[PDB]
Amino acid sequence: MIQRTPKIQVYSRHPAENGKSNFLNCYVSGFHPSDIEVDLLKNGERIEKVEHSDLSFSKDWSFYLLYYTEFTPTEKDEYACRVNHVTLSQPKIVKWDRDM
Amino acid sequence: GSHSMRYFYTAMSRPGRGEPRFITVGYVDDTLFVRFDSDATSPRKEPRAPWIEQEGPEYWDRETQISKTNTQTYRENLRTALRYYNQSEAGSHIIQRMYGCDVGPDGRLLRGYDQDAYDGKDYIALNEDLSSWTAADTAAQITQRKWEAARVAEQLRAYLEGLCVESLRRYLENGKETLQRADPPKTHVTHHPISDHEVTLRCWALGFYPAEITLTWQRDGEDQTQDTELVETRPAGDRTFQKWAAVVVPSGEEQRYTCHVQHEGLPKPLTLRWEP
Amino acid sequence: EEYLKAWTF
DSSP states (O other), X not given: OOOBXXXXXXXXXXXXXXXXXXXXXXXXXXXXXXXXXXXXXXXXXXXXXXXXXXXXXXXXXXXXXXXXXXXXXXXXXXXEEEEEOTTXXXXXXXXXXXXX | OOEEEEEEEEEEOOTTSSSOEEEEEEEETTXXXXXXXXXXXXXXXXXXXXXXXXXXXXXXXXXXXXXXXXXHHHXXXXXHHHXXXXXXXXXXXXXXXXEEEEEOTTOOEEEEEEEEEETTEEEEEEXXXXXXXXXXXXXXXXXXXXXXXXXXXXHHHHHHHTHHHHHHHHHHHHTHHHHTOOBOOEEEEEEEEXXXXXXXXXXXXXXXXSSOOEEEXXXXXXXXXXXXXXXXXXXOSSSOEEEEEEEEEETTOGGGEEEEEEOTTOSSXXXXXXXX | OXXXXXXXX
């Protein structure tokens, strides 16, 4: 049967401002089947207690979820989403970039 | 404005790992108001919006019952789907349903829906007439025959023109401070040099509700569909949505490009430029 | 508000 690979975006709820508290989000979308593993990373390492939205889907039946955690961005602290799904042979890492 | 209510079911089998998970989520437009999960500690329909908390204990009991009964229903459906497609009982499969109603600004039924999919593929859909069905294949025609025999469309039709629109009308009045407020996008154009010879112009839209939005770039008043990178509208986490459109442009040519924004919360469409 | 019934395949 047929499988669709997740689309990935890492972004903040509000425009990033160093030392100013915010939310880091990872929005995975366009995927099928529904099972997915998404981590938010801080300098390479799994942020604990990340929360997520309830499983829903679009008109084409492809699923989507928001994963989110509080964060205070800084100059040098790197941030990323790490995503795995049956469609991917390896976990996909996507870095946070304040201009994306 | 025009509005919609939708219920989304996902039923996911997981052989070796218990009975299929059943999830239901309800939406008015782009706002989730209710949820149910069979994998919850004590599964019930839960409020997800302040304007639904209103409804009394009987509402919550009656809605929970519906979801517990439908858990069994969609679990049977999954077993049946295996047989109709001659599939093994070792694989994991998914059934989804969407159903609900659209209403116009006077709150009259614009159209109703009832659609199922199996493994991300169309299975059966109630047609727009609310009287007939479209089966995607010979498996789904068995269901159609069963549903035709049982006069299912008639029953959906009574619901869709009746309770679906009555409740959405009530939800809209109770949640009118948010459901009937459109928030316009906050828009700006950013500038990111790529090379000596090329730059990215990125047109942002932030803080908007509902999710619908058009963001386009023009060069000398001509649409740049092929030459624009357009991200999927993403949620911010505070009810609002975000989007951006990007164009790579030659150095010195930034003023030939204009960003155009259309959104419900905007009385007229917007035109933005890179403003150095 | 949901509809009472769902029907099997």
